Amino acid sequence: LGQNMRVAFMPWNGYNFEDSILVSERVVQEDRFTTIHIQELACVSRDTKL
Amino acid sequence: KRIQRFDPVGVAAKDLRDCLLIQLSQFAKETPWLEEARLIISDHLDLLANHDFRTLMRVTRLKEEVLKEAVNLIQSLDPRPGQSIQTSEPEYVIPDVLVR
Predict the structure, then answer these.
(1) In terms of CA atoms, which chain A residue is nearest residue B95?
(2) Distance between CA atoms of B6 and B84, rounded to whole angstroms?
(3) How many CB pairs under 8 A join A and B?
(4) Rounded Cα–Cα distance for residues B63 and B42 (Å)
């Protein structure tokens, strides 16, 4: 359940003010932690009076 | 005319085929067979209404088997486009002995 990502301990440049995580373009590149989903829909025939 | 200069093509048609005429006018002149399509729509409306393709070719002097393309272009002009807006009707059926 989850990705084992490298990190380093330091604040910097306000982008990590209180509870922020600074993911650079790297984890965008290899796109680790990309989300998967499958979602459904349907329809009916409903032989009607009209 | 200003109302007809609004969606959909042929608003306040009153006269029939005004949707067809409005769509043809909106259609660019770059489209081929558009002149013959307009000729069929404007005054050969009865000729096409009777499906008098031979009579349409003989009267409109349009090329044989080529005026068919113009007639098709006229057909693709959203007749009763205003009826498109109306798409939802309530369902009502009373099963007085419902075999299932």
Answers:
(1) A49
(2) 15
(3) 8
(4) 18
